[PDB]
């Protein structure tokens, strides 16, 4: 196997609450080693179907999408999580890959009344907060939740998750900090993949749940479409911050919840300071967790699939490939040096 051969799955240029079309993925993957099938209708719409080229051990790296920004574009958005896994895949296996799309930012806006709020020349929200300490009329301004990245398979009809990299939550309109919570990871399939709690903003979509609210992100098995914005913002001034494709929760004055195996929560009320929670990532028991779940992605999510470098041949099972076109180098822990044998450490 060529060590440099990898398959990279992107959003195919799609953005917002809906996934890419077949033409978009054909255009994004033109002149590459990757060819996918994208469903056009039903709950599988926007999900790329890939055929495993050979029966082998594959490393699958999932990256969730980042959440949207709040009213002031000065606080960094919540980054989507990365989950690395090692799986054994048979030839002609079909992998269903949803690449999570970024949650929409509050600013900038093509609507000029909202754009005035974005540049600080309209402070109706600030006056509303100073007079009531709660936003009820001038709702809106929180970013939508980022979509999660799902890599799964259809074992006898029932979808079976393999890797789920959570999407980041949306930032609130008045997010005064940049503190972010530890990445939650789920490895037990008996834990239900439920949606996040929805308040004024929409909670993130889960793996398998029933979604009724329009501003809540859908779960994976019902489409994983990002939720709309809260009705109050749209009715007041049409300030739309939709959740990203992949279960991202729609925004309000509060931030939307990110997608995941378990969707990220949203504030119960329309708190203009509460960001949405990131989703819960998932690693299947049918695979080995390579690296812990870590928040990395600042935009859309992605998937990277490559042949897993089998390195049980040397004493330390961990190894790497030398970039300057060399052979496999097995690494040594602490301060031990590689022996002349090139297997053990001393």
């Amino acid at each position: 196997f060529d060590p440099t051969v990898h398959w990279l799955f992107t959003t195919c240029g799609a953005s917002g609450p809906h996934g890419p079309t077949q033409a978009q993925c054909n255009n994004a993957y033109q002149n590459s080693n990757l060819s996918v099938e994208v469903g056009s209708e039903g709950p599988l719409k926007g999900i790329q179907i890939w055929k495993v080229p050979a029966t082998d051990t594959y490393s699958i790296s999932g990256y969730g999408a980042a959440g949207g920004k709040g009213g002031k574009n000065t606080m960094m958005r919540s980054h989507g999580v990365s989950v690395l896994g090692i799986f054994n895949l048979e030839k002609d296996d079909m992998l269903y890959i949803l690449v999570g799309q970024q949650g929409e930012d509050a600013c900038p806006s093509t609507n000029q009344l909202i754009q005035k709020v974005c540049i600080g020349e309209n402070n109706v929200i600030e006056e509303e907060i100073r007079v009531n300490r709660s936003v009820h009329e001038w709702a809106g301004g929180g970013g939508g939740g980022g979509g999660a990245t799902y890599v799964f398979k259809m074992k006898d009809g029932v979808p079976v998750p393999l890797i789920i990299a959570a999407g980041g939550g949306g930032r609130a309109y008045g997010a005064k900090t940049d503190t972010f919570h530890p990445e939650r990871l789920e490895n037990n399939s008996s834990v239900l993949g439920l949606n996040g709690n929805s308040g004024a903003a929409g909670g993130g979509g889960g793996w398998n749940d029933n979604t009724s609210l329009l501003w809540a992100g859908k779960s994976l098995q019902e489409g994983a479409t990002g939720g709309h914005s809260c009705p109050q913002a749209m009715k007041k001034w049409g300030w739309e911050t939709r959740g990203g494709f992949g279960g991202g929760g729609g925004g309000c004055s509060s931030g939307g919840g990110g997608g995941g195996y378990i969707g990220g929560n949203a504030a119960s009320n329309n708190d203009p300071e509460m960001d949405g929670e990131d989703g819960v990532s998932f690693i299947s028991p049918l695979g080995i967790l390579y690296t812990p779940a870590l928040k990395v992605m600042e935009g859309h999510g992605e998937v990277n699939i490559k042949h897993y470098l089998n390195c049980s041949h040397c004493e330390v099972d961990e190894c790497h490939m030398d970039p300057e076109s060399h052979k496999v180098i097995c690494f040594c822990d602490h301060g031990t040096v590689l022996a002349e044998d090139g297997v053990s450490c001393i």
Partner: protein
């Protein structure tokens, strides 16, 4: 030129032996740390690994 560049964004972070085992994987087996243009992503990854509960012992 290739390792201190990441340190300028991440900082002099400490590690444990399990933290080092995960650090090697994140450093040589992910496109974030093996593609120079993605250096920022690499930094974030390392930073998160610093605050991960495994390394927080």
């Amino acid at each position: 030129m290739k390792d201190k560049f990441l340190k300028h964004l991440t900082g002099p972070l400490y590690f444990s032996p399990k933290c080092s085992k995960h650090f090697h994987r994140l450093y040589h087996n992910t496109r974030d740390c093996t593609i120079p243009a993605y250096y920022k992503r690499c930094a974030r990854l390392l930073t998160r690994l610093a605050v991960s509960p495994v390394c927080m012992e």
